[PDB]
Scaffold this motif. Structure first.
Motif, short mmCIF file in Angstrom:
data_model
loop_
_atom_site.label_atom_id
_atom_site.label_comp_id
_atom_site.label_asym_id
_atom_site.label_seq_id
_atom_site.Cartn_x
_atom_site.Cartn_y
_atom_site.Cartn_z
N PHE A 1 0.84 -1.21 0.00
CA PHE A 1 0.00 0.00 0.00
C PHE A 1 0.87 1.25 0.00
CE2 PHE A 1 -2.86 -3.01 2.40
CZ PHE A 1 -3.73 -3.23 1.34
N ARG B 1 2.11 4.43 0.51
CA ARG B 1 2.00 5.63 1.35
C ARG B 1 3.09 6.64 0.96
NH1 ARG B 1 4.14 3.70 5.66
NH2 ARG B 1 5.81 5.26 5.80
N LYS C 1 -16.55 34.48 4.55
CA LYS C 1 -17.58 34.59 5.59
C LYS C 1 -17.11 35.36 6.84
CE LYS C 1 -17.13 30.25 8.23
NZ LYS C 1 -17.76 28.93 8.51
N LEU C 2 -15.80 35.46 7.03
CA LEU C 2 -15.21 36.27 8.11
C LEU C 2 -14.93 37.74 7.73
CD1 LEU C 2 -12.61 33.59 9.30
CD2 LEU C 2 -14.89 34.01 10.26
N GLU D 1 -14.69 39.83 13.88
CA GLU D 1 -13.65 40.16 14.87
C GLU D 1 -12.89 38.91 15.31
OE1 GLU D 1 -16.57 42.54 14.98
OE2 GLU D 1 -14.89 43.29 13.78
N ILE D 2 -11.72 38.71 14.70
CA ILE D 2 -10.97 37.46 14.83
C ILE D 2 -9.86 37.64 15.85
CG2 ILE D 2 -9.55 35.74 13.62
CD1 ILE D 2 -10.81 36.95 10.98
N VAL D 3 -9.78 36.71 16.81
CA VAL D 3 -8.61 36.57 17.68
C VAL D 3 -7.47 35.91 16.91
CG1 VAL D 3 -7.70 35.46 19.77
CG2 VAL D 3 -9.96 36.52 19.80
N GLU D 4 -6.24 36.38 17.15
CA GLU D 4 -5.04 35.85 16.51
C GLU D 4 -3.86 35.80 17.48
OE1 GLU D 4 -4.27 38.05 12.91
OE2 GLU D 4 -6.13 37.29 12.02
#
Lengths: 369, 129
Positions: free
Chosen positions: A5, A7, A64-65, A69-72
């Motif tokens: 198999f 991989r 969509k964002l 208000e995004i945390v980073e």
RNA sequence: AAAAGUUACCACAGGGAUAACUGGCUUGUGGCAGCCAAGCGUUCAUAGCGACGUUGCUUUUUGAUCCUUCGAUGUCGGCUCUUCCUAUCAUUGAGACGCAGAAGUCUCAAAGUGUCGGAUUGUUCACCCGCCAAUAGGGAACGUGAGCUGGGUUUAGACCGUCGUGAGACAGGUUAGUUUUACCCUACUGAUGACUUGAUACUGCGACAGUAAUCCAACUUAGUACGAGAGGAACAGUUGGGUCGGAUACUUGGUAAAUGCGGCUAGCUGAAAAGCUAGUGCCGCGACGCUACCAUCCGUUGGAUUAUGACUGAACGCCUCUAAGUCAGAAUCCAUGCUGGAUAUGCAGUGUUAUUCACCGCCUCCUUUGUUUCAUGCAAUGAUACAGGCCUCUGGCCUGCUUCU
RNA sequence: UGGAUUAACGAGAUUCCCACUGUCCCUAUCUACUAUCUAGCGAAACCACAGCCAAGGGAACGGGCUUGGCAGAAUCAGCGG
RNA sequence: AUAACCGCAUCAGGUCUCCAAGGUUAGUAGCCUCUGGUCGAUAGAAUAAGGUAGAUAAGGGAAGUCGGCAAAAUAGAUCCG
RNA sequence: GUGGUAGUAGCAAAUAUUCAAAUGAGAACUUUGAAGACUGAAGUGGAGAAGGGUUCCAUGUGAACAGCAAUUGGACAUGGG
RNA sequence: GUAAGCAGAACUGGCGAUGAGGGAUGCUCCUAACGCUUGGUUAAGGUGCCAAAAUGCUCGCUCAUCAGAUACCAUAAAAGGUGUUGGUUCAUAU
RNA sequence: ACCCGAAAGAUGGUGAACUAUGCCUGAGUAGAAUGAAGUCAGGGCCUGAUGGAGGUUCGUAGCGAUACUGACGUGCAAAUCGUUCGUCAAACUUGGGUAUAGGGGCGAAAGACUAAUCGAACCAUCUAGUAGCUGGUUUCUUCCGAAGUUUCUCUCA
């Protein structure tokens, strides 16, 4: 017989061998190409890693964002101003580049001078003492060489780690290339920096991709599983944190592509990591338009392993490592890059609740002496 | 065009069933848009289409391979506002070969990312998140 | 010679003179590719096919053989892990069609990247359920047992059926049955380290070696092109996801012998208070650290060409991608970038160079010894072309450093 | 040479279900004793000679032979071609 | 008899009999203690990989495997059934 | 008879030792005290048999033996029982 | 016998019992068989360098985006080519 | 009978301290669960006590050894260690004494056991047993220099 198999491979062969490098600061390799067109500027910096904290910003991407208000997560890097000292010409030969002549400043501090000794406490501290009397009697013989010959010019700068809260003093010396036009004016740029502190705002700006050089944090001798990312064997005589089959019979030899046990971490190593904020040590660093509360970018109880009261820079190795930054090899525009940054809120709170220490005092009230 | 969410259910998992089609259970069997890893059990997140059997339910609705969509999830995941939601229970809805839900009413809560994708499951939901 | 069996309870001397594995010669058998053209293909041998014949290739099948091995090369299958091949299933760029579109079938450059989750069987194969861009075929001692596993085969116990008068036999079925050693040399992975026109310190250069990213989906493009209608694309742009790789710990999760704080059981210290023993006595929370697609971040842009399509243009008054000349051109190749460089016993720049009889430099002058793969003038500085060049240039020269000093 | 049954019993041979789990997806952390380093003590199997490869031929799978690639002291920890 | 016996030995093995305290408990079970006995088993320093034994793991719950092998889960007493 | 291997494998079960003073050429290891542990009466306790045969007891000690050490000893020597 | 570095024969010569020079390398092919040696000459086979001897002389053919290169010998075929170099024989310069 | 080498045969002795079985005489084995006959009361054969049977069950010591195909495998050990596991008042466990001996014994039968020796023990002898089969076989030069084919052979090493 074939594999059964098919991989993909464990680990890249790109980075080899996996051994601790001979250098504590990141050596740059490959400065960006010269536009005889721009004014002369420095293309790199050095700073000390501190700790990282999250920040809140408004996305400007139709994702969509969009408009949310995004945390980073965000690393603070302590960057007190790098003092320019020397300058170095480089002849272009058919073998390679080759240093023609190094010129140095008149008066170096004991901050820089520690680098040249392995035992400072014993020595009579002679470094650049014959040179200093030679300088007063300067070097416009040897600077004329660099104007005549020499395709490439590099300022020798150095750090100021007495101002940092590492117990260091020793100070890293570093070549940084000068990329603008006209080989005379590169030297005139370097000459007028002699014994002047270069701040960080001279080099980098808010909203800019930076390529980050450093050394990874060490883990010593680690086995196959952690080191290479390999399948753990089933619940196997002798043991099970290891490969079963190294190799086929022929070649009658172990191949270099098979993964083994050995060193992990302390490897010299990124590109496209956005700068959010250039700061100032001179209050209201973490203060923004939105929150309007007086803060410094030290969190409460320090950065664990401490303070920072210098110039810094945020952006998208171990603590107290000397990072180097680089100006990106081509100026690129990917929408993701060339983004409007808008910081609502920087966090300066083990598990912190309160943003500031006077806010804690209000909550608990009059405590008992 | 769903954003990644932690995968809380492998192929083996047996979950609850919201809708009025009469199935109590849903036993997962495969996932739509699953590629190729050696030994990795294929797993599904919130929101996304799967395949399933019913284990107990209405007798015409058993021993077939229905498509479902996943609606709640006990595994935690990170919304971009910086906190970690997780529901009380795993649960899903029996669905047609298009993607529409079969049985119209939906008990329980549903996720944001179910209602954000599928228009019909948004309308019939009582209260999202 | 005057002469029946059996041994899986077995023994001894030997045998690679001689079987059961690999390897080697061979390639009938298996597998793959050509040549001819009777017909099929509404019409039309050749888009796609191809009888009757006939020429090869391969060692992934199975025989044939007995060269090697019987003072032993550890006999299936799976797991793990690496690499290689191309006779390419998908992905890239083309060409052909009985190619309107969509979908395909055929062929060329292509091995850069990828080839999955399960049910039954010891299986190799096989056959189903599902996903997917696709679930192509193979090699490396039928890769891989001092790597595991021991389900199968192939000891000794026992059961059934058939055969045998019997002991016993069966490429018939059935269950129970030990998997030993690395500390040697090399290889591979990591670690120090002597020495080279001095020591010691800092900044560098980069020969050479390794390399990394790769696929899919949605939104618009568009119910547009095309089509009688059903159906139904593509490029640029926008946004995500998978697989793979490299970092990191703000947050979420995991870890607890910081035995950190609290709670509880048994015993023991006259009690209370403080605890201690039960090899971590238990339960809850538990910073720091380490850590997870169970968390977060990041994954370059140039040149030369392949297939192929073209330009100009002869040979052959015309034509022609080719003969002489060019051009475009790919998931390719080489750089670039990235990792190392004690991978060149490689090379450069710069700092300081021994408390004042005490050694230590550098530059001349002149003597002791001892090294050299190699003293006898061991000698000579335009830059080109070759169906042309050079100038002391209205002239002169070339046909050799065979010359000129 | 027994045929067909059969409650109770079984460290007996099979199949399915519920419960339960690090067997698994998918690995991670923690503990002790080790390995490791030092002081003292201190064996053995094994050993023609030795120990880098490619192809070639050869008793038809060479460490030595031919033709190439190459080749720089001395050491420690691992590993199983 | 974990050193006077036998196992080549001051060897984690084996070898007949008697007496037999307190607390917890059904209990000569396990756990802690008094009398009697002992600290005999080479030490010190570091805390890598890999081992040996021992713990714990979010979501899923046998999808692992020849096979639930290993480990989890259940457990005492009373009352109902 | 002697090498390489090699000052290498290794000396890691039975929870555990520490501080002081005395003795001595010399003390991680002998003795005495003080602490701290274990055994936990189907005991590593107190007595017999088989088997052993002076190992019992005292004083003394240069080796060797007690897989480190040793002022200690079931070792060695001279007495006694 | 499909064939085999397969099995079985006939005649002679070898290898085995045997080195030396050549075939890069090879028990069996080629030259040639050996007492210790000085000089001369050849054999097989070769003469750009490794490598002793010709970048010798002279006349043709070949351009390969897998040229070819020395008996045994370490493989190649049917069928094609308006690539080029010659030949044979018809028909109006082709 | 050049040197070394079998599997075996026979003759005469020594062993039951280990193990197999019989006999004689001694010793040994917590605490729970289940509740058989027998008996006593009350009701018209039922109900409640009482009682304490069993090659009964759970489970200590003692006897044993299923799994991990765990540790160890130049071991602590020529069979050990760990966790797990079987049985536990009987066809039980066990000391001493005594009986059975080698083509013989003993065997709840595996060709098991009979002093680490068993599809025929051990010791000595006959014995330097025999071998068309392996392996070795000790100084120098000098000269000559093979055969692997014929026929017969329980002959085809």
């Amino acid at each position: 017989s074939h594999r059964k198999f098919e991989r993909p491979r464990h680990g890249s062969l790109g980075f080899l061998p996996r051994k601790r490098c001979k250098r504590h600061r990141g050596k740059v390799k490959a400065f960006p190409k010269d536009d005889p067109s721009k004014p002369p500027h420095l293309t790199a910096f050095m700073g000390y890693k501190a700790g990282m904290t999250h920040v809140v910003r408004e996305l400007d991407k139709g994702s969509k964002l969009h408009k949310k208000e995004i945390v980073e997560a965000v690393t603070v890097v302590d960057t007190p101003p790098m003092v320019c000292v020397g300058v170095v010409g480089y002849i272009e030969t058919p073998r390679g580049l080759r240093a023609l002549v190094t010129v140095w400043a008149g008066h170096l501090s004991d901050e820089c001078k520690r680098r040249f000794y392995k035992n400072w406490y014993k020595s009579k501290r002679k470094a650049f003492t014959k040179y200093a009397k030679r300088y007063g009697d300067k070097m416009e013989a040897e600077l004329t060489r660099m104007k005549n010959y020499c395709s490439v010019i590099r300022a020798i700068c150095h750090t100021q780690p007495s101002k940092t809260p590492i117990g260091s003093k020793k100070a890293h010396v570093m070549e940084i290339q000068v990329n603008g036009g006209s080989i005379a004016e590169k030297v005139d740029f370097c000459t007028k920096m002699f014994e002047t502190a270069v701040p960080v705002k001279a080099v980098f700006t808010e909203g800019e991709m930076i390529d980050v050089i450093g050394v990874t944090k060490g883990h010593g001798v680690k086995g196959v599983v952690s080191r290479w990312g390999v399948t753990r064997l089933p619940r196997t005589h002798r043991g099970l944190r290891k490969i079963a089959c190294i190799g086929a019979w022929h070649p009658a030899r172990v191949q270099f592509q098979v993964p083994r046990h050995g060193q992990k971490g302390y490897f010299h190593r990124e590109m496209n990591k956005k700068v959010y904020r250039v700061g100032n040590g001179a209050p209201r660093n973490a203060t923004t338009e939105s929150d309007l509360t007086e803060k410094r970018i030290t969190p409460m109880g320090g950065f664990p392993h401490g303070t920072v009261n210098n110039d810094f820079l945020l952006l998208k190795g171990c603590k107290k490592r000397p990072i180097t930054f680089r100006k990106t090899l081509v100026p690129r525009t990917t929408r993701r890059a060339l983004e409007p940054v808008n910081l609502k809120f920087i966090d300066t709170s083990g598990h912190g609740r309160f943003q500031t220490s006077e806010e804690k005092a209000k909550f608990y009230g009059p405590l008992k002496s | 065009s769903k954003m990644r969410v932690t995968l809380g259910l492998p192929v083996g998992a047996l979950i609850n069933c919201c809708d009025n089609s009469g199935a109590k259970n849903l036993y997962i069997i495969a996932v739509k848009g699953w590629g190729s890893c050696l030994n990795r059990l294929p797993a599904c997140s919130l929101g996304d289409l799967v395949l399933a059997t019913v284990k107990k339910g209405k007798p015409d609705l058993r021993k077939k391979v229905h498509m479902a969509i996943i609606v709640r999830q006990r595994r935690a995941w990170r919304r971009a506002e910086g906190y970690f939601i997780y529901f009380e229970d795993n649960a899903g809805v029996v669905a047609n070969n298009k993607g529409e839900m079969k049985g119209s009413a939906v008990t329980g809560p549903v996720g944001k990312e179910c209602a954000e994708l599928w228009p019909k499951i948004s309308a019939a939901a009582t209260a999202i998140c």
